[PDB]
Design a protein around this ligand. Sequence first.
Ligand SMILES: *CC(=O)N1C[C@@H](C(N)=O)Oc2ccccc21
Length: 377
Amino acid sequence: NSHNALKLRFPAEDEFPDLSAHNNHMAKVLTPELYAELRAKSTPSGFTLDDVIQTGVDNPGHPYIMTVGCVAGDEESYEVFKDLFDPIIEDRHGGYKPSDEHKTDLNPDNLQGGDDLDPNYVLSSRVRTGRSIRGFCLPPHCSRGERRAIEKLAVEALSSLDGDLAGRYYALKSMTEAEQQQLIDDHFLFDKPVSPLLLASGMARDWPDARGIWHNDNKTFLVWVNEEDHLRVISMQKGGNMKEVFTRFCTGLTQIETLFKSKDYEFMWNPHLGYILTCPSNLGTGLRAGVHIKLPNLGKHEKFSEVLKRLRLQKRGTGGVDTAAVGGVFDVSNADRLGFSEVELVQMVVDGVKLLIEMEQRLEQGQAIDDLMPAQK
Ligand SMILES: *CC(=O)N1C[C@@H](C(N)=O)Oc2ccccc21
């Protein structure tokens, strides 16, 4: 690329971004020396360090909520600029060292229990993840031709799914106002990105070309094509049979991967980073296994955050599916993504939810939970 060479004509410090008041991990890792060493490297697709750190430069963040500050344009991005990604991965994934190994377990039989979470508290159970198809650039860097290719192969694979997974595909471009309305009412629809995060990163290029929503006829399995990763996979079920949701998650992923392999394509995966995705923060399992749960008394407790932290879980939001119950209903999911297998995260969620329910009941009786406080897991 001639532009990166023209940049190289400038002193490195003269091209170094001003990350003074930034609070992302990239700003915490990017020394002026690292920029000098890597500001010349590039990936086969043409992804540069500036293309990796632009979002972090434009989007400072909050000290409380530390964003990663960088994205990947392709698989090779994680190795070409590993001298930058690895420290941020260590900092954002609990000290995951460069030599650590990620184990991926997708055998639902290895999860203990989780079939009967108290239906009077757990309203919904959902497991979400992402996948990148090897050989294509990621959404921040992919091309119209690429994107259209991935959409074609993904739609073929989904159209091959049958049974409880048999479903339909809606292309965002061809959607009628009626179909769009139905999807919005279903909470299945993703709209055109508007955040200064995504728009600056180029994740919204050529919208809505090659972007789609596939869902099974039972509204329990949903796939998003070319939105924020090549595929975004969600398995959801009203209630608390987390085992069923995770089993659907696993089997659907396995069938999709089998179809892709039959067509000589595969997911981006390695034994150190797990599955490869645009954002470093979703590496390894990209798994967000959560529950919408009625924990009104516990939510107003001054230890709720500490209990969630010790259980290795996070409160990703409040309100539940239909907003409404903000303060009473909470969306609680696994906090870790890399360094733990999928089964381990789902386990952690089930186990923590049981104790949360017990705490909520005890607080209901007017008693104290100081005896039920867990130890850091
Ligand atoms: C990790 C992630 O999803 N990010 C990080 C974010 C930031 N500014 O730190 O920027 C973007 C932009 C586009 C896609 C993903 C991310």
